[PDB]
Amino acid sequence: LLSDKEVREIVQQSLSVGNFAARLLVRLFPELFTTENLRLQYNHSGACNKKQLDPTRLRLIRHYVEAVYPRAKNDRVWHYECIPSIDERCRRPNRKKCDILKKAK
DNA sequence: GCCCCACGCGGT
DNA sequence: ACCGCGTGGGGC
């Protein structure tokens, strides 16, 4: 639960509605985005042998998304732009692979 | 370096 | 067909 001021401040910095959902994810799930990087054990559905993000916080994220971006009320926009960005955010690595290969030399 | 997003691909 | 992962081109 976060203020209207803070939601609009998040909208200011997000690039697309997918990134709005990703940012609301990071802000609402600060436990997973410490240097512990627990995010790498989670996704939005509980698929691919991974733990499932808090369904109710995810619902709140969708609430804010469909609120700011009304077009998000279609499941075909949430399921196709936000939850892919949410899962990518939870899973994306610290160091890129090719960057790790490049720092070898 | 951080961060975003498109995208081939393999399991379902 | 669909769905999520690993991955890298690339803007900042």
**Which structural technique was applied?**
X-ray
Q: Determine the Cα–Cα distance for residues A104 and A74; give it in Å rounded to an integer.
A: 46
Q: Determine the Cα–Cα distance for residues A72 and A82; give it in Å rounded to an integer.
A: 9
- What contacts A24, CB < 8 A, 6 or more positions away? A10, A60, A61, A64, A65
Q: Helix or strand or coil: residue A52?
A: strand
Handedness of CA A85, A90, A95, A98 (dihedral sign): negative
Q: Determine the Cα–Cα distance for residues A91 and A41; give it in Å rounded to an integer.
A: 8
Which residues have CB under 7 A from strand C?
A 43-45, 47-48, 50, 79, 83-84, 87-88, 90-93, 96-98
A48 CA to B11 C1', in Å?
A: 9
| Residue A16 structure tokens | 């697309």
**CA torsion angle A51 A52 A54 A55 (round to 10):** -160
